[PDB]
Amino acid sequence: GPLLVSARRPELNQPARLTLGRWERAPLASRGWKHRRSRQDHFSIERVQQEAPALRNLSSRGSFVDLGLEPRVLLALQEAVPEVVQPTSVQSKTIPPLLRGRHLLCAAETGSGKTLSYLLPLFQRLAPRGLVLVPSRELAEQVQAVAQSLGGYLGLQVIELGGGLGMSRLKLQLYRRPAADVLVATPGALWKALKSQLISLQHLNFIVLDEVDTLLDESFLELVDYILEKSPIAESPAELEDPFNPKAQLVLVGATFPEGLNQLLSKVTSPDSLTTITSSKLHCLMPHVRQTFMRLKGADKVTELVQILKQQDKASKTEPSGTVLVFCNSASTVNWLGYILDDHKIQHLRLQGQMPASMRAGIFQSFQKGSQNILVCTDIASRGLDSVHVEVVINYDFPPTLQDYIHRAGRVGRVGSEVPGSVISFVTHPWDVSLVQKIELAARRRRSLPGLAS
Amino acid sequence: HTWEEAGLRYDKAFPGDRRLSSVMTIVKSRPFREKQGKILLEGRRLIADALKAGAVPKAFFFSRLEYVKELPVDKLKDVSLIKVKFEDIKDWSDLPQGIMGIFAKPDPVKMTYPETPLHHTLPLVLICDNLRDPGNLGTILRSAAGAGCSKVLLTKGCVDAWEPKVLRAGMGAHFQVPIVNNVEWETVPNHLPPDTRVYVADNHKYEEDLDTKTRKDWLPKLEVQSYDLDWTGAPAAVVIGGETHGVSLESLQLAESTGGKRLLIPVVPGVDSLNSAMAASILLFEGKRQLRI
């Protein structure tokens, strides 16, 4: 049968029909990955699905009308976003309760339609009318652009507010633009505006939290608390629809949820009033995406990295190929590797968190514009980055945690992906052998990775 | 197909050969060249130039076996002769008409320069100040090569002389002139021969090497000496204003302190600092004339 796991050493190759189970320790291709003397021992997980899982079974999910969406909204949706002909599983389950004003918590993978899951009820339900909190500035640009595009069809104004921006420059943008019904802001900048009292949340009717796990980061945890005291929150859907006593509807969207979030939600609303929806593929390995694991030293990584680039160069020379995303853990390696790429006369982009905010915004848009097909970026780009046309994700530096890998993984195999996504990760020395062992073991058992519970 | 015939050995590119992969890392990245001590030559003529100069090579990669037969295999002792794809040549070279030659990073003080320039080789040093153009650097070396400068110094920020593109710009000038790279200004006086008067062609970014408090008041009032006046009577040094930074502050201070002056070439507007190729060429030659006369 077709190999579920393919390795450089064939004796350990697995067929399409074998499951070992929890008690049995699988003989992984990374089980014995210790001594560098056996160079280049690799293994790739092949693509098992030819249809996109999000697009697959769309006919088996109820129509938008069944979700309570008005036909008038559908007509605007068809003009604004004709691409979404049918709702995904997350969209089907999430939209109906939101239109009813019930507080909703959505746990689903990237590219599953989470953004549209709440935006559609958000617009129909509707001194800002809606609030969107996003951890990274890059996500703010994407959400604001998506929200603005929908707003333009509905005659609504949307603006973006990025954290780390100067208070006097922050005010300049606000005064140069008309008042926005819905505001997309980062915790750092939004906290600055609230401290200066540039905006009032008493009239806020809708609050959106994206990447709650990232939003709950200690860098933004205190800022969120300051927002909460100034934010009136609805306790029941009845109060939400009460014109005499209007309150804010809370919606939560994330891929993972740290333990204790219920206590934070309990003090704001009853635990039984929280509607929790979990994606069937949440914390599950992606079969439709190819994952490549190569044994490379830091010196040898450059050799294989360029060899992979030559393969992509050869692939482009034969047929059109999608963009390649290169992930590096540290900026110093990006600059150090970037000079090597510059030495090779290779057009590439360099992105890291500490770059100037204005410079980063232009480069991010330029990559979206397709200015350069090769992008080297750090973990700041693993969140809120558009990767529809990205064919290969190259983790030059192995991701430190599974969650980062999932965020990097979500970039490939998104809805509307023009090219089949692939994932490549490099292990310099036996530093993260356990991480590779867990991934391979889960694939053989076809189980979720341990410790991913939300 | 690797062939062993009548004492002549030449290999063929192997599937998965790591030897080729290391070439581009060595070839394209100068720090790796320093780390490994290797350089690349482009073209048969420049390749043949190194063989005549007796430069120590490392490896030859060639598309056609005819080149090996054309080349003297006796002089190919230190090179692994490997037949490679023409696609590999372009893959491993951004530029090579079927021939690629990797050579050991030569030591110019140890390089073999025969008599003909040595008869006219003087204790004259050509100094390029922050020369950031690889094309100028290689072609610049012709003037020092033809003039016969004993040794050449490049200030920090200058391009690597041993880069193949610079080798392309000079078309073998590196095998005709001794070169010292990444020379620190503090060590420049030691690099100068005894009694050397430093004469600087004066054309500015050197004002960025000054403390901000004293930046605007630290401009040296060095005497302007016309470059046509005799300066070779005793040991002398020539400084060239870089196309990017021009003449640095240290050069101006050194010339005044060393008993020299400004070997001032009036720099024509339209070229803020006389092109280092032009500034270098003019000064070196007629110094030979003055001494010959």
Place this chain on the structure above:
Amino acid sequence: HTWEEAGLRYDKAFPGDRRLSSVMTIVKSRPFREKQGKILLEGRRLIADALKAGAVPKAFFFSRLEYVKELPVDKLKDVSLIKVKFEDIKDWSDLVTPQGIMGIFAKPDPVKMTYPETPLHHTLPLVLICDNLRDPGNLGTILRSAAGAGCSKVLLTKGCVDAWEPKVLRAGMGAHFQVPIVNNVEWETVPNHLPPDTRVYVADNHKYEEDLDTKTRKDWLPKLEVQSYDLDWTGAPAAVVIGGETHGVSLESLQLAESTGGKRLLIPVVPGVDSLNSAMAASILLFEGKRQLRI
């Protein structure tokens, strides 16, 4: 509709015009240039130097108005100013990204060309002849080299690079228009091009000389005495001949010098290498006269 902004009037071009397709092939296809006899100039300061230097304008296509301010508005009065889409500009040039503007030019007349007086202040009674030049970047570097030097006059003989070829002019970056140049001079008329009896010094040690032994290079043609380059040769009006890239000087050049009383100039090179990059070959010899004449 012509747009009025900052006192500059520029039209909006229409993409897909067959005129662009014809020029598209002319610039990209080098042989096609010879058939049509058309040339291209790229860059705002290159164009600005050209028009100030007598270059004949035909039309200017610019992507942005900011460049037009940098263009020679004095010489744009009678020239078509059209703001075009950068895609049309990109297709024409061998360079994917021009400096936002490109222009079509007729053959400039060297007599009408106006060169900055700044080279002239350092200019010598020195004339230059180029033989069978084959590199444009060296030519632009040579003229950019000459712009730094101040060569009085340059004569380009038949078989050399088309000095008005688009990429040739780009390398000069305005230096083509800072020094006089004469194109496609026939070797028969070369002595007429120079002042008669002006001492012509031929640079000789070349690629053709590498194949030919020195002994069998003086029997059928006039014998020129070989002197070191550092020997003073500019005591009288001096003319210099420089061999083309990896080609060398021709038979007629050696005949010319002896008839005018000139001599061969010898560059002692490290044995093992004969001639380095020809780009500076003119520069190194051309300057040798420069300092001599000042003395």
Place this chain on the structure above:
RNA sequence: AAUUAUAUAACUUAUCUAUUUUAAGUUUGAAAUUUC
């Protein structure tokens, strides 16, 4: 291999000797540590 490598051995300075106006450096390596 990388990293060190006052085992020794050399040179320099001491040292100890002549006259007379082992230790500290460096270098080798007996080796040491880790990797392959």
Place this chain on the structure above:
RNA sequence: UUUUGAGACCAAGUUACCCUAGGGAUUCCUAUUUAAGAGUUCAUAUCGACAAUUGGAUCAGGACAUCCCAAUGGUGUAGAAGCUAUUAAUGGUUCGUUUGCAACGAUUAAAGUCCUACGUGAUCUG
């Protein structure tokens, strides 16, 4: 230690001196293994070959983003030439040099810009 200032550290070989863990195999038929071709279609219903136990040369195909050829409007087109526009991939689009990113030479009605796993070649032996 509170505050104030504009879980291989990094790091190559080799082992037939080895140790452990295993994986394999140990002329016409006959028994395993492999499966081009047979079987209208369809390898294994029934059979069943061969076996295993380099730069180049040759020939090009296609895209239109139209260089030559071709069909046309307009003109600062009298005619013819041009110039300016539309339409059209119809067939063509040379031979070399390239002191290896570029270019020259000689021709052509023209020597468009490219794509087609170097676009495309199927020793002999171990």
